[PDB]
Design goal:
This is part of a larger assembly, with three copies of chain A and one copy of chain C.
Chain A (H helix, E strand, L loop, with lengths): L16 H17 L10 H4 L12 H7 L7 H9 L8 H9 L22 H8 L10 H5 L21 H4 L18 H5 L7 H8 L6 H7 L1 H4 L4 H5 L1
Helix pairs in contact in A: 5-6
Chain C lengths: L5 E6 L5 E4 L17 E6 L5 E6 L5 E3 L20 E4 L5 E5 L8 E2 L17 E6 L5 E6 L4 E5 L6 E3 L18 E5 L4 E6 L12 E7 L5 E6 L5 E6 L3 E3 L1 E2 L8 E3 L34 E2 L11 E2 L9 E5 L2
Antiparallel strand pairs in C: 1-2, 1-23, 3-4, 4-5, 6-7, 7-8, 9-10, 10-11, 11-12, 13-14, 14-15, 16-17, 17-19, 18-20, 21-22
The chains are: A mainly alpha, C mainly beta.
Chain lengths: ~240, ~675, ~325, ~60
Amino acid sequence: STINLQKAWGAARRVSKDDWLEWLRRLSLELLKDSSSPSLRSCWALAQAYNPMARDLFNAAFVSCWSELNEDQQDELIRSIELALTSQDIAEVTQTLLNLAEFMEHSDKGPLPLRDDNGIVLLGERAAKCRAYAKALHYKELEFQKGPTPAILESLISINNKLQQPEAAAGVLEYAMKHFGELEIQATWYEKLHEWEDALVAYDKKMDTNKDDPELMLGRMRCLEALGEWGQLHQ
Amino acid sequence: LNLQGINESTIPKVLQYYSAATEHDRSWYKAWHAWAVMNFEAVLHYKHQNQARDEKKKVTEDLSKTLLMYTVPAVQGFFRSISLSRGNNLQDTLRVLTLWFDYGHWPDVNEALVEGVKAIQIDTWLQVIPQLIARIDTPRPLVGRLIHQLLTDIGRYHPQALIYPLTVASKSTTTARHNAANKILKNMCEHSNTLVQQAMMVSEELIRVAILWHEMWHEGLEEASRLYFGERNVKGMFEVLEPLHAMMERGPQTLKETSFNQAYGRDLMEAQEWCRKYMKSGNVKDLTQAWDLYYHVFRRISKQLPQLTSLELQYVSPKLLMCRDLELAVPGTYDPNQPIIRIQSIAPSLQVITSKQRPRKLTLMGSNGHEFVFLLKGHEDLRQDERVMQLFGLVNTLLANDPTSLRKNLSIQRYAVIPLSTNSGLIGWVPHCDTLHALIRDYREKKKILLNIEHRIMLRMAPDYDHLTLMQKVEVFEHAVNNTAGDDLAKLLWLKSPSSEVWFDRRTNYTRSLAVMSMVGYILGLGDRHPSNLMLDRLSGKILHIDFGDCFEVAMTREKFPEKIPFRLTRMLTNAMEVTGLDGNYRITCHTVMEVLREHKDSVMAVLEAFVYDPLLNWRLMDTNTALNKKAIQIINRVRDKLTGRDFSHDDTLDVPTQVELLIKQATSHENLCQCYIGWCPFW
Amino acid sequence: VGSDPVILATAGYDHTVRFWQAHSGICTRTVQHQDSQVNALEVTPDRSMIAAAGYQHIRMYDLNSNNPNPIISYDGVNKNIASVGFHEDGRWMYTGGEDCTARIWDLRSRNLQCQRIFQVNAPINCVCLHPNQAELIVGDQSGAIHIWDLKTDHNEQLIPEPEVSITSAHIDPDASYMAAVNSTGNCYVWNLTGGIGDEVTQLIPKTKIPAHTRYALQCRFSPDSTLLATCSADQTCKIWRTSNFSLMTELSIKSGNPGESSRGWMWGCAFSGDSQYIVTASSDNLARLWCVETGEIKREYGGHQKAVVCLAFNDSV
Amino acid sequence: TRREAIRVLGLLGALDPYKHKVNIEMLVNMGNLPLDEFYPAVSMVALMRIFRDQSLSHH
């Protein structure tokens, strides 16, 4: 259970969904024999019979295997996690790979050191493609408590219309008034939250200073068709 | 009202203006609702005119003979609203009584109650049963004697929901109050002769389970000693001792009562003889032996107070062991449209909560195979805490018509308070819920952090924290906020949920359900609320509160720095809400509550006229004065001024978002948090 | 100690009151306090003793004799006595409580009670007094400056604006300007009127200056009627003048570290004889001697170990 | 079937879920016990999913 660890990690030969689902089953089989506790061995005889048995005890067999090696092949485990979801993203495979990074942070030993970033952008975009909106809000307080950059708060407005929580996105516009200013306020927030009354002053002060932007031209012409003023729109 | 208002010229105009709308549609509810409200406000306006222009019997007669003319629009306007209410009987029932509470000695009221009481359905007046008993001592032969006719009509259907307010009526203090209650109890024994004699046996023995014999002698000595030693009491000390001297005539019957006889029953009867050696002159040596015996038994009682963890019911009250197969149903949940659910028996052993105020956590046995857990208290105040329980359901009733309130789906849980006596009661314990004192204090040992680690450093900074001035309590506040972290309470929720979809829902339910009583308690006037009264659901995350019994200047009477803090603004309640700012789940949550609590005037002005005018509950205004006419007008004045929102500037009427903004920066800044008591703990 | 015309005393939280000298750098002695705090410090103008006031006690120390003892302790008044007022030579004494009372005390009387009671509707924050017992200026929490007379009770109630919280009040010896700084930072400037035998004192609104943003602590005029300082809690102080209101020197004790805050505030200020030196008390346990015009570090005394709120200052030469 | 079932479900109209609701364990025990006591207390948790009515008839 030591020499054979360097075989099923760096494969990178997965094309069809049979192979992508066959890798995780033998990975769950490999995680069983490394643990010194005898409770993990009894499920190895049942894993050959029951086929979803890989989706039963993969959380408990991960920490007992990660905390056993002598701090040398853990980076190979990180590279095996990171190179598994690079290309050809299957949805349940990404669900399994995000469930591997779930059991660790409930303990008192710290979260997993994936990418030396604790898994913010890499698994969050995969959960956003798999429509996990409860998982998309977990790294938001990771991004907020590690330095507010202007590429954070513009992504939470796109995960609120399909969440149908308008009060969570309504506490965003007044947050930038007394903390951020005026230069960081765009017309993206007024479009997805379905209002077109107070933003017309912003479209007039934005489109008259610079040239006629095409996206702002498409957004300006909705001000007459969403409120019911079809007289000026025909002109 | 927008142009002129109320004067002596628009009163006969609006009568014609509403009787024009009345004659078209008779089945239209508002023609007998709004016209009835317009008739009801005229009596209160005339009373305010009399008390503000004349008083501050020659004017009383000119008021009464004028109200005799305005009676025929007033009394008959409500009964058509109660024959067509169909669900909202919280307003149409009491308004024919409050005038009857004031001027019920009239023959017009006598002929008016014939067509209303004898021509109403039975499913309307099944909710006003405990409220119509507390007016038993009326000297008028017409007002105080209609209840004996009313219980004949009420008691014909559903007799199971009647004895729970009738039990506390036969245990009154003076003589003339409980004689009519004994007459009521003799009148109630004409149906089956099964429920009264067994319900008394259940109630008195559960009171015997609730309080013990040796528990009351603790405060019975602590009062009767300290009054005589500190406040110069002579005759009131015997008045304190005389309920204890009027107890030992029944005699011991059981094993615990025999243990009390062999443990203490030798000097309790004898010490009265020492009192008989005190009444002749007032000597010292003829009484200090009784003080020696009292101080000897006080320590022997106090040594057995940590030795009360689990008890068996055969020692204290084995009267629930002889005969079985009763009909005692579940108290509080008796619905007329649901089948009855009876209780088989009582559990022999039950876990008892040990605390400072000595509660009990009792259980019952249902008929479906499920347990029912209740809280049992004693020597406290809950007669004022049960008058705020009926207003917890009418909010959920009122939020079921406006489409903004339907999109939030409020789930405000409630229960029913069962009265036991003037000092003890039964609290409905909501199962699978918890306070936050058991979460943080068990989570604090998980990260190797002791309790006072934020406190002792302040003792390094300023050991006179309860003695500083106003300007010197400014820098000491933010030392536990800026230095220490605040994401500790947000992780203990993460260590409980199995997934993240339920987790964010429960964490946001922790926040969206605290701003629904923060303004209702602002109307009611809450203050000095320790977090052990919080009630958090450990399955869904709902916010409830208990112990509402210090409102209306009672919380602003004490001298140990009385705070002006309506809702909590510590770091826990701030960092529990997530990182979008401070108005995400607070401003939009308060956007909905304001209209549904503002324009429903008939429901918000139908509850506070009951317990304030209750003569058994005015004593909370007695605790302010170390009379009632000056205070009772100003209470409703303050209620109206908080409902209109004209509390700070009295020039204009502010709208909804400005009034929401007024309840933000009044507790955000630090001038109101440093005028607080040490028990509030702003460093948490 | 008693022969020093520049008297400077600093009190802390560890029951220590220390007298500091000007140009020597030698600590004289310490004064032990009994289980409470001292809220106000003021040198009596007789150049013999010093008065103080704290929680549930009013005591006075000595300047000539080392390690004195309390002889007469006027008690009976509780609940955070903060504001003090004294005679121009050291005869009368006035304490300010929060119970809406204006007590009149004496150092040579017999009764241990007050003389008369003036009732208001708000707790008293600041007390200002004329040196010959003429008028009384009372600041409150609600924002109503009261001018009161000792023998006729001519009330003058002035409400500038609701939702304010004033800090301190001061008047120049020329009796011509008055400044009121709230908790927000609005500096109300009022012009006086030279009425001695008539008590005219009709106030005129000169100029409102919102100088500071955060909370203020204390404002004080210059003895030469030239400058005006307003201490704030944002670790800086922008001193101004009277005539033209020009920014001369911004005394900034800020750190610049975003990961380390709450070092020390600008608690107390004291103008010198020619308005050149100033005494600065902070919470960093480093008593610095800043300058008015230049604004640099001259002397440094790390003697005290706890925070300092008030000081005692006298230039009785 | 697919092109007509959409017509059936769309010719009725829309529907709100708040009126529809009027008509109509795994990670908990680990939060109290440490990892040394959870590793024997998980295998039967991995064994009771076989004890749901399906996967017994062949093994």
